[PDB]
């Protein structure tokens, strides 16, 4: 049905739980946003589900994505992470997360909260993309492009326009659920 079309054809409970409980559901917590963004930066070259199934390994490797702690991680911490089981052993991907955490802190120093900074890009309100078929879906737009460029200036890495657009969908700043998907969030 509509769920199968919306949820990338998966019958895997982990992916289906993510589709229903996380993907496209507006997320307002600053640290939870950082975490989702950081996981997204790890995707390129792998499947998304592959990253999802490494989430717990990442949480342990990165102090549950607590930005103050992640930002303090050293070259030596990254050396250790190169053989930490079940995270992606791609040094620059891992270093990227440390740089992201640093950028997060810079943003919060300027604007008070990472959440507020992000949500400003959709004027504080989820953008219902109003899709009806999976074939309607785009992979990048002007807003994701601008956010990507702006993040880069703060030191964020591995977060190009396409990757930032996927994160917008996942964090529910964009709702990319199909109209008849049973998990489509309600909008005011
Ligand atoms: C459902 N999905 C597919 N691909 C990605 N890169 C994703 N990121 C968050 N959610 C995603
Ligand atoms: Zn859906």
Query: Which residue has the least CA distance to atom 9 on ligand 1?
Result: 170
The resolution, in angstroms to one decimal, equals 2.2
Pick from 5, 164, 157, 10: which is nearest to 93 by CA? Answer: 157
Sequence-separated (6 or more) residues with CB below 8 Å from residue 45: none
Residue with tokens 């990048």: 140
State the distance from the centre of ligand 2 to the C-alpha of 56, rounded, in angstroms. 24
What's the CA gap between 17 and 143, in Å, rounded? 28
Query: Which residue has the least CA distance to atom 10 on ligand 1?
Result: 170
**Residue 186, Cβ neighbours under 10 Å: how many?**
6
State the distance from the centre of ligand 2 to the C-alpha of 29, rounded, in angstroms. 22
Assess contact for 163 and 40: CB atoms under 8 A: yes
Q: Which ligand does the CA of 134 lie closest to?
A: 2
CATH number of the domain bearing residue 12: 1.10.340.30
State the distance from the centre of ligand 1 to the C-alpha of 75, rounded, in angstroms. 29
Q: How far is CA 134 from CA 5, 18, 65, 180, 185, in A?
A: 6, 17, 32, 11, 17
What's the CA gap between 146 and 158, in Å, rounded? 15
Token pair for 159: 């977060």
Q: What are phi and psi of 13, to 5 degrees?
A: -55, -35
Length of the chain: 188
> Does the beta carbon of 170 sit less than 6 angstroms from any atom of ligand 1?
yes
For the chain, the straight-line distance linking the first and the last C-alpha, in angstroms and rounded, comes to 25
Determination method here?
A: X-ray
Provide the Cα torsion 60, 35, 2, 4; round to 10°. -30
- Domain of 169 in residue numbering reads as 1-188
State the distance from the centre of ligand 2 to the C-alpha of 112, rounded, in angstroms. 33
Half-sphere exposure of 43 (CA within 13 A, CB side): 18
Helices vs strands, H then E, count in the chain: 11, 2
CA 146 remoteness from chain centre: 16
Assess contact for 91 and 98: CB atoms under 8 A: no
Number of domains in the chain: 1
State the distance from the centre of ligand 2 to the C-alpha of 165, rounded, in angstroms. 17
Assess contact for 87 and 77: CB atoms under 8 A: no
What's the CA gap between 47 and 59, in Å, rounded? 19
Token pair for 142: 């002007």
Assess contact for 40 and 166: CB atoms under 8 A: yes
> Does the beta carbon of 23 sit less than 6 angstroms from any atom of ligand 1?
yes
Atom of ligand 1 nearest to the CA of 23: 10
> Does the beta carbon of 183 sit less than 6 angstroms from any atom of ligand 1?
no
């Amino acid at each position: 049905g509509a769920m199968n079309e919306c949820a990338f054809g998966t019958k895997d409970p982990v992916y289906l739980n993510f589709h229903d409980h996380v993907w496209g559901q507006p997320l307002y917590d600053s640290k939870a946003l950082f975490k989702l963004l950081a996981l997204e930066s790890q995707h390129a070259g792998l499947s998304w589900l592959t990253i999802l199934k490494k989430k717990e390994a990442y949480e342990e490797a990165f102090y549950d994505f607590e930005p103050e702690k992640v930002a303090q991680m050293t070259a030596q911490d990254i050396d250790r992470l190169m053989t930490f089981p079940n995270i992606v052993h791609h040094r620059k991907k891992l270093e990227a997360i440390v740089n992201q955490a640093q950028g997060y802190l810079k943003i919060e120093q300027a604007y008070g909260s990472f959440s507020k900074f992000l949500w400003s890009y959709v004027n504080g309100k989820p953008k219902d993309l109003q899709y009806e078929h999976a074939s309607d879906r785009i992979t990048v737009d002007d807003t994701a492009t601008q956010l990507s460029k702006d993040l880069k200036q703060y030191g964020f890495k591995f977060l190009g326009p396409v990757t930032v657009f996927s994160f917008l969908e996942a964090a529910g700043l964009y709702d990319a659920h199909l109209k008849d998907c049973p998990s489509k969030p309600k909008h005011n």
